From a paper:
Here we report the cryo-EM structures of the trimeric S proteins from the BA.1, BA.2, BA.3, and BA.4/BA.5 subvariants, with BA.4 and BA.5 sharing the same S protein mutations, each in complex with the surface receptor ACE2. The five sublineages of Omicron exhibit numerous mutations in the S protein, which is responsible for receptor recognition and facilitates fusion with host cells. The RBD may exhibit “up” and “down” conformations in reference to the viral surface, and only the “up” RBD can expose the binding site which is responsible for mediating the interaction with the peptidase domain (PD) of ACE2. This interaction triggers the conformational changes of the trimeric S protein to further expose the fusion peptide in S2, which then facilitates membrane fusion with host cells.
Numbering used by the authors:
A (entry chain C): 590 to 621, 640 to 676, 690 to 735
B (entry chain C): 27 to 66, 81 to 140, 153 to 172, 187 to 210, 215 to 247, 264 to 540
C (entry chain A): 736 to 826, 854 to 939, 944 to 1027
D (entry chain C): 979 to 1076
E (entry chain B): 736 to 784
F (entry chain B): 541 to 589
Write the structure that this text describes.
Amino acid sequence: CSFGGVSVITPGTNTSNQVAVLYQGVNCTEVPSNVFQTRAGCLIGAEYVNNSYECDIPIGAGICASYQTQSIIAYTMSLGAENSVAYSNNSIAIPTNFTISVTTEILPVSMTKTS
Amino acid sequence: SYTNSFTRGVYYPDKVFRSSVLHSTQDLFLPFFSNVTWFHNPVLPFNDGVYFASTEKSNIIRGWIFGTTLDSKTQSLLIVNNATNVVIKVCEFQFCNDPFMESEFRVYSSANNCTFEYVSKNLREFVFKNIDGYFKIYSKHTPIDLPQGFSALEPLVDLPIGINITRFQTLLALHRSAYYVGYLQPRTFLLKYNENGTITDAVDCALDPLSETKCTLKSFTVEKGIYQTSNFRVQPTESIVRFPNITNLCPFDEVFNATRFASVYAWNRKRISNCVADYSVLYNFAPFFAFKCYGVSPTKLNDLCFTNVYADSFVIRGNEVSQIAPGQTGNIADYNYKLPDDFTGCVIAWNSNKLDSKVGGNYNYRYRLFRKSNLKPFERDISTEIYQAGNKPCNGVAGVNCYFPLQSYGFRPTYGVGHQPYRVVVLSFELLHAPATVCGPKKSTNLVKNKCVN
Amino acid sequence: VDCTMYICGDSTECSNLLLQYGSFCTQLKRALTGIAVEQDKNTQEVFAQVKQIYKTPPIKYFGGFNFSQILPDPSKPSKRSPIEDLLFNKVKFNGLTVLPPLLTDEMIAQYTSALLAGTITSGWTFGAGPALQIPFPMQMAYRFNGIGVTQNVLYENQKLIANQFNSAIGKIQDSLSALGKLQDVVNHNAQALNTLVKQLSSKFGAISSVLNDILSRLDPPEAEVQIDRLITGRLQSLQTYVTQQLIRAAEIRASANLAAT
Amino acid sequence: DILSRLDPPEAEVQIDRLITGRLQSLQTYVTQQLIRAAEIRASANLAATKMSECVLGQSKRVDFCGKGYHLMSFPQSAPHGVVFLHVTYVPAQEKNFT
Amino acid sequence: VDCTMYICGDSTECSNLLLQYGSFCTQLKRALTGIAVEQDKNTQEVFAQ
Amino acid sequence: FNFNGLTGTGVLTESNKKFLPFQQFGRDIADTTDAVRDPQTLEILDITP
Ligand SMILES: *[C@@H]1O[C@H](CO)[C@@H](O[C@@H]2O[C@H](CO)[C@@H](O)[C@H](O)[C@H]2NC(C)=O)[C@H](O)[C@H]1NC(C)=O
Ligand SMILES: *[C@@H]1O[C@H](CO)[C@@H](O[C@@H]2O[C@H](CO)[C@@H](O)[C@H](O)[C@H]2NC(C)=O)[C@H](O)[C@H]1NC(C)=O
Ligand SMILES: *[C@@H]1O[C@H](CO)[C@@H](O[C@@H]2O[C@H](CO)[C@@H](O)[C@H](O)[C@H]2NC(C)=O)[C@H](O)[C@H]1NC(C)=O
Ligand SMILES: *[C@@H]1O[C@H](CO)[C@@H](O[C@@H]2O[C@H](CO)[C@@H](O)[C@H](O)[C@H]2NC(C)=O)[C@H](O)[C@H]1NC(C)=O
Ligand SMILES: *[C@@H]1O[C@H](CO)[C@@H](O[C@@H]2O[C@H](CO)[C@@H](O)[C@H](O)[C@H]2NC(C)=O)[C@H](O)[C@H]1NC(C)=O
Ligand SMILES: *[C@@H]1O[C@H](CO)[C@@H](O)[C@H](O)[C@H]1NC(C)=O
Ligand SMILES: *[C@@H]1O[C@H](CO)[C@@H](O)[C@H](O)[C@H]1NC(C)=O
Ligand SMILES: *[C@@H]1O[C@H](CO)[C@@H](O)[C@H](O)[C@H]1NC(C)=O
Ligand SMILES: *[C@@H]1O[C@H](CO)[C@@H](O)[C@H](O)[C@H]1NC(C)=O
Ligand SMILES: *[C@@H]1O[C@H](CO)[C@@H](O)[C@H](O)[C@H]1NC(C)=O
Ligand SMILES: *[C@@H]1O[C@H](CO)[C@@H](O)[C@H](O)[C@H]1NC(C)=O
Ligand SMILES: *[C@@H]1O[C@H](CO)[C@@H](O)[C@H](O)[C@H]1NC(C)=O
Ligand SMILES: *[C@@H]1O[C@H](CO)[C@@H](O)[C@H](O)[C@H]1NC(C)=O
């Protein structure tokens, strides 16, 4: 007999109080507007789109959610801009200038000692 | 009319001070955004606590009445407040059906056996509940259709009364020269305390999915993301049972209408073992004059399972049917048929005229009159030797002080009830050591499909 | 694993008894969730190391080197190389739930095909900035220089090195048509899930293993003590499951850190 | 409270149940600290390795000392951790040639 | 370890009652075997170069 | 100490908390008693281990 977790998707209480709900691996005919079927369950309260954005809130199986277009919407995730390299059999590209960059990396080293 | 509460009926669940601590509590509250009846009067139910708000600068509400019967012959609570202060009182009253110079108090006309005494625009809120014989009141008076806001209510009284309540009424000050009624339900909230220790906000943990997230995280501010808060569980409907057909029927059918029964001194013993026994044909027949079911109840015969069943059958007089019982005495118990002191079956007997009586006398039925020593439980004698009551042997010849031991019943149809023949069938159940035998039919049954079911 | 359906299994007498043990289910859900989130992080750190999705030119021909067995083949399930097809072709009970990965296999294939296009058309320049094109024969000459071999040795033997490379790649499919390091992970977890289920038929010192049995035929005061023995034994099994998942999760993370490096 | 409202013969059983339960709590706690301490130890080993190879020298390891071509790094102290400031060389503004 | 010999120590009453706890003695053996095989793998990969 | 039912051990010191005029004792986060009110003198005292 059907059963599964229930998760709540929120843009943050400092943005809005709208919410969508995912019923994990529940068929959309056995749940009891905007109902969207994903391989992870049924998503209700989120408008599905065709465009593709950067992932914000990960849902699963390639589906993410975002607060953009306001109620709350869904969409697929984009791996990143597309670019063709201008390859040929006698062409080269060489830089004529440069920049110096600085980046951070953070690593933990210890915990509190308990007894 | 009805109105919509907003966040009302929140009271301090207990003592215990506290600081900045998003504490979670379970208790009897008025749910947020609830459906509260409106009154501008009749006896109302209680069922579990009461929310009571009102609005008015003057004082129209002049006490309440509580209890189970709201009448005399039993004790009740009465709360009044004149221009002095609140007066709790618990007596047996006699209330006016319409209770209400400047003279007043025409509410009751009796105050017997008092077990408690005490003496001493605008929004006046109250919360009433009654738990383990304690009648609690919370209240607060805050100056300004109700508005919108949050305010926690503090304990007012502590009353060790013991009183039961199922209904109550209200009292109003008439003109001679507006209130709310909610009820409480078991809910869970997440309460926010300030540094002074007061409740400043709350979350109803059984309303909006966002509130369930707040309650699980123990916060009133949730950061953007996705949170697992609970679970979905489909529930089964109906109870489908499905047992086999039937097959046999344990032939009680022929034991009860056999065309001849035996004399009481030579009774019968049928032992049905391999059976599905349906005692409903017995119980729902009911022409019976006696039915004494001793060890087990006449209703639970269709849910047990024994190893053996022994059914006896004989014909006796009417005023001897009472000797068929565990622990008895008489010519029938001692010499003919004795039931043990630990009997676990059940005797069933019915009248047998028109099939046993005979105009002229039916001497086919006999019984034993003289025996040297009483019988044993479930023993049977068929001896025809001549009893000897004297001191001389008679060599199997009747005469003086030597009697024939088997006398006869002379059943005629123009007898009196209590001398007419009766057919008796005593049943006896036992479970020796065999791990299956006769037991009744399960009961109803059916089927369905494509549905989550039990 | 839903702790309530494992331990009690749709039984209200048992469900209320779970309230006397405190927050054990809170620990169980967090322990398994905390290591489930890392599993998607492990795959992002290995494959999502490129910002752009690079494509190769249609004229698949690089100084004589034949890369058609490692590049996507526009005529297959989804979009795998002929060699990846060998790699993928060779390899609701009572609460025990399996969650899907965040990245699908189609999404991983698209990360790996972008890495392949970058290293063939742009060498090692796309990993330090913009992708800079350079012909492939010249990339291989640089790579010989980096190991101590002069560049003229490649240019005068270009045909030999291309023939040797092309045969060497073609031998890979024979060796695949191996993967025990992947099959062991699937088998070890499957055996742990099966063992967890089988501990639901132990008495743990009770008269029966079935909760709808004990309480029904016995005596409530006694049924409560025996049901608590079943709860304790099944909780210990479930806690053992979680401890071993944390110990195994560290081994998968250690491997994923090496694969990312 | 057990003793206050119960005889010893039965109080030993009730206290033994609580002892077993709370002793299980300690075993759970200590087992997780050992598993979690191995993870912070692996992180401290990585931080010590970068301290040697990114700060006390110049590395050719790709992406080990930041994004770009490693020039130098400067350490900073953080509470229970370390922060690396990675200085890299990034080319810009390419032109194509034959 | 030989599970039965530690817990019961060759006693037929205890060992028959021990069966009522399922297969804990199979898990103990698998766990010890899995780490005892890696001890030779660890040495083999350091020196057989 | 015992304060009308509240049984415990610790050092009693003058507090700086302010209870509501119906509350007897306070608890800290994790629900352990850390302050009481003396029934006779009506003063709040902290309880330290
Ligand atoms: C070097 O030349 C190549 C073409 O051989 C340029 O790539 C072209 O760039 C334009 C402008 O972005 C695109 O519209 C064309 O589609 C590209 N052609 C190909 C075949 O991809 C490249 O931008 C040039 N580099 C510089 C610095 O100018
Ligand atoms: C390399 O890049 C830098 C900018 O990052 C150029 O320096 C700038 O040059 C412009 C004039 O073209 C000046 O107005 C700016 O003040 C310079 N910036 C700085 C920070 O000095 C530099 O000229 C570039 N080199 C070439 C050859 O184009
Ligand atoms: C015991 O036997 C009598 C007769 O032997 C049964 O009477 C029968 O009743 C049914 C129901 O009306 C009739 O169809 C039959 O014709 C009757 N029998 C005769 C011979 O006519 C009586 O029903 C039997 N007892 C039970 C409980 O069935
Ligand atoms: C690169 O190798 C592939 C094989 O891996 C070559 O494809 C084969 O080409 C021959 C000749 O046309 C066919 O008989 C085979 O059926 C092809 N195999 C497949 C799987 O299609 C391909 O021709 C080679 N490329 C170059 C440029 O030589
Ligand atoms: C270097 O070795 C390779 C073999 O590894 C030689 O190439 C082979 O030469 C034989 C004999 O001419 C041919 O039959 C093979 O077909 C060649 N193999 C390949 C893959 O081309 C090569 O000749 C050697 N170079 C020198 C200078 O001796
Ligand atoms: C959060 O709220 C603050 C005000 O309290 C505001 O300044 C800030 O922009 C908000 N953040 C977002 C992401 O909306
Ligand atoms: C849900 O059930 C319907 C049939 O009632 C089926 O057509 C549909 O594919 C199911 N959905 C999923 C996600 O399995
Ligand atoms: C998305 O595009 C498909 C065709 O590729 C179309 O059938 C569908 O209606 C579109 N969805 C929306 C929300 O417009
Ligand atoms: C409250 O419920 C009653 C039915 O019991 C309904 O008639 C009434 O409209 C409801 N009130 C509100 C405010 O929804
Ligand atoms: C107030 O009411 C109580 C209860 O009837 C009564 O005992 C008391 O005398 C009243 N006070 C005055 C001033 O009438
Ligand atoms: C209650 O009052 C009745 C008279 O009305 C009396 O008979 C009875 O004894 C009283 N009960 C008590 C407990 O005083
Ligand atoms: C209240 O009524 C219940 C029955 O509804 C009864 O069992 C109980 O004893 C009563 N309580 C008191 C204090 O009389
Ligand atoms: C209590 O808090 C209020 C603010 O909500 C503040 O105005 C008041 O001064 C405080 N009083 C005390 C004793 O902390």
